[PDB]
Structure formats: structure tokens, C-alpha cells
């Protein structure tokens, strides 16, 4: 599923991502835009053999299990395919644990390089929330 800008913002707000650990809703929509282009089925191969999955490109090296990343962790206790669903519930709940381990949203490289320090509210402007 390819989310719309306002459609994803409302789904993220309903799942409690607005101001979660001090990160306004514009940060999560901006991150999902530059990580997956609002595509829930987006996957990308990392150089170390791990794979990023879903709307937020959650890596399999730590958070999910895909069966081919040897020596990795499954900290979110989910199959990585559950992150590719049109229901972003699994990706949201796992992102809440990732953003809470100390580094915040810096765990998403796209957010650090393309959203951090910018006007993130412009990603939710004009949306019925
Ligand atoms: C929280 C999370 O899984 N972040 C990943 C990270 O593993 C990696 O640096 C990158 C790979 O392209 O994409 C995402 O930012
Ligand atoms: Cl915002
Ligand atoms: Cl594995
Ligand atoms: Cl949803
Ligand atoms: Cl933080
Ligand atoms: Na894993």
C-alpha cells in the first residue's frame, strides 16, 4: 500500500506517534517519506546482509526476524514480513521501541540527514487531524 501524506499522518496519530517521546507527528511522516516513499512494501538490502522493511525501513539486524540475517536480534519479536503489511500497527509499535532505546529518531538515517533540523510541520499541513 502506498499511503498518502495526510492518510499516513492520521494513521500515525491514531496509533499514538504524535509527540511520542517529544517527536512531533511531522517527524514520523517526514521519515517515512524519505525511508520508503510512503510504500509499506519497500525493502532494501544492507551491505552487511541485513534488510530494511516497511514504511519506516526497520532493519532486520536488530528488530525483526527474516530468517537470513545470521547472528542478528529480534528485539520487536515479529517476522519482518509483518512490517510490510498495509496495517502499520506492527511498524508503529516496533518504532516506539526503537525510538526509546536512547538514540531517538537518529536510528533512521533518512530522518537524521533529511528531516532533522528542518520544518517538519510542513509534512502535516492541510491534513484533517
Ligand atoms: C531504525 C532502523 O531500522 N533504521 C535503518 C538503519 O538500520 C539503516 O541505517 C538504514 C539502511 O538504509 O535504514 C534505516 O534508517
Ligand atoms: Cl509536526
Ligand atoms: Cl535471522
Ligand atoms: Cl493502518
Ligand atoms: Cl530523543
Ligand atoms: Na533479526
Swiss-Prot record:
Keywords: Allergen, Antimicrobial, Bacteriolytic enzyme, Disulfide bond, Glycosidase, Hydrolase, Secreted, Signal. Substrate binds at residue 101. GO terms for molecular function: beta-N-acetylglucosaminidase activity; identical protein binding; lysozyme activity. It is found in: Secreted. SMART domains: LYZ1 (SM00263). Lysozyme C is capable of both hydrolysis and transglycosylation; it also shows a slight esterase activity. It acts rapidly on both peptide-substituted and unsubstituted peptidoglycan, and slowly on chitin oligosaccharides. Disulfide bonds join 6-127, 30-115, 64-80, 76-94. Belongs to the glycosyl hydrolase 22 family. Lysozymes have primarily a bacteriolytic function; those in tissues and body fluids are associated with the monocyte-macrophage system and enhance the activity of immunoagents. Has bacteriolytic activity against M.luteus. Residues 1-129 form the C-type lysozyme domain. It comes from Gallus gallus (Chicken). SUPFAM superfamilies: Lysozyme-like. InterPro entries: Glyco_hydro_22 (IPR001916), Glyco_hydro_22_CS (IPR019799), Glyco_hydro_22_lys (IPR000974), Lysozyme-like_dom_sf (IPR023346). It catalyses: Hydrolysis of (1->4)-beta-linkages between N-acetylmuramic acid and N-acetyl-D-glucosamine residues in a peptidoglycan and between N-acetyl-D-glucosamine residues in chitodextrins. The active site is at residues 35, 52. CDD domains: LYZ_C. PANTHER family: LYSOZYME C. In the egg white and polymorphonuclear leukocytes. Its EC number is 3.2.1.17. Monomer. GO terms for biological process: cell wall macromolecule catabolic process; defense response to bacterium; defense response to Gram-negative bacterium; defense response to Gram-positive bacterium; killing of cells of another organism. GO terms for cellular component: cytoplasm; endoplasmic reticulum; extracellular space. Its main location: secreted. This is Lysozyme C.
